[PDB]
Design a protein around this ligand. Structure first.
Ligand SMILES: CC(C)N1CCC(c2cc(-c3ccc(F)cc3Cl)c3c(c2)N(c2c(Cl)cccc2Cl)C(=O)NC3)CC1
Length: 349
């Protein structure tokens, strides 16, 4: 049941894809690979296809390819980017060297659409509800996104939202330096490596996104790591004794204690004119001590989402086995595991 493949060149890249996929049009290329939009004649869906760039060129890249395929194959939720299809034109492991990943075409991200704009409260409710719905699912599988920001939120013309580009990290030091959106949505404990982080980092990011949707302004647009920390602590207060103890980094703990203590600000005086329920939720997400932040499951039940919340339609995921992360395998071993995952793929019903 191997489909028939056909070939075409799009901006200097050869795409070899099953006949079902028609009207391929490039959207972009980079180190990540190449993306096109297409129409899936079999399902009637508008799709986006990612062709991975050299996916087995080093041990690190082979493992990265396996990691992404595993994550995308696991995710089956309305608010999370998952796989409609995955294919290779290769007929054997020996000739296997290209991976194509098919998902829904959303066509924009939240950053490209609403940057610098203040959204209506009902609009923010719908957008944040969807993010939290997807996060409840992701977190239930013990997956951490780690890099949630407006540009990682795929959105269509009806403001329907799917979370993408996650569980994958892994930014360079340069990319996180200076006046950059790559760092503005990061929880302080991960930005400054205070301690072993967990899924609560994502809730901080949601707080930062929500604030920005409500105001049209970046919440913590730091010019560098330290400037950003100062912006954060001005809003949420300096750490107390309880949190200082949890900062397992001696150097980081020492630095924090050099700062003049500041109390948490009144969020009602920061977010002037906002829905008091939005203000309440922001206070519960933007807690310095990650242990004390609201979870996605808890936030869904918050009164702010009364119009959207349905406890019978906020599903959880199967557990996700990431034991492979602890393994040092050879290129050909990662490649074989990836091939097994490609060939074992079963499409959605
Ligand atoms: C961080 C940079 C390097 N990265 C930004 C995201 C890009 C990107 C990747 C993927 C993707 C993800 C997983 C998968 F299995 C297959 C695919 Cl194609 C999609 C999109 C964008 N978009 C999209 C958006 Cl969000 C805005 C405009 C146009 C388009 Cl096509 C979709 O609509 N659907 C899927 C890839 C490059």
């Amino acid at each position: 049941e191997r489909p028939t493949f056909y070939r075409q060149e799009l901006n200097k890249t050869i795409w070899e894809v099953p006949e079902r996929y028609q009207n391929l049009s490039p959207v972009g290329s980079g180190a990540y690979g190449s993306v096109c939009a297409a129409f899936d004649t079999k399902t009637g869906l508008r799709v986006a296809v990612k062709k991975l760039s050299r996916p087995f060129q080093s041990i690190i890249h082979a493992k990265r390819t396996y990691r992404e395929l595993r994550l995308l194959k696991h995710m089956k939720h309305e608010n999370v980017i998952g796989l409609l299809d995955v294919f290779t034109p290769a007929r054997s492991l020996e000739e296997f060297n290209d991976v194509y990943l098919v998902t829904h075409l959303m066509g924009a991200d939240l950053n490209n659409i609403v940057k610098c704009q203040k959204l209506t409260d009902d609009h923010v409710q719908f957008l944040i509800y969807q993010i939290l719905r997807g996060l409840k699912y992701i977190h239930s599988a013990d997956i951490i996104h780690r890099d949630l920001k407006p540009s990682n939120l795929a959105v269509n013309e009806d403001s329907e939202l799917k979370i993408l580009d996650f569980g994958l990290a892994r930014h360079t030091d340069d990319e996180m330096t200076g006046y950059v959106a790559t760092r503005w949505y990061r929880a302080p404990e991960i930005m400054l490596n205070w301690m072993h982080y967990n899924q609560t980092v994502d809730i901080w990011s949601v707080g930062c996104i929500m604030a920005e949707l409500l105001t049209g302004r970046t919440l913590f647009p730091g010019t560098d790591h330290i400037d950003q920390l100062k912006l954060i602590l001005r809003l949420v207060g300096t750490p107390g004794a309880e949190l200082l103890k949890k900062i397992s980094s001696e150097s980081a703990r020492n630095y924090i204690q050099s700062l003049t203590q500041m109390p948490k600000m009144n969020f009602a005086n920061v977010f002037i004119g906002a829905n008091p329920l939005a203000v309440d939720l922001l206070e519960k997400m933007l807690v310095l001590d990650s242990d004390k932040r609201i979870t996605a499951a808890q936030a869904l039940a918050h009164a702010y989402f009364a119009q959207y919340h349905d406890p019978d339609d906020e599903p959880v995921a199967d557990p996700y086995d990431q034991s492979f992360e602890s393994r040092d395998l050879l290129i050909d071993e990662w490649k074989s595991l990836t091939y097994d995952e490609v060939i074992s793929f079963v499409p959605p019903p």
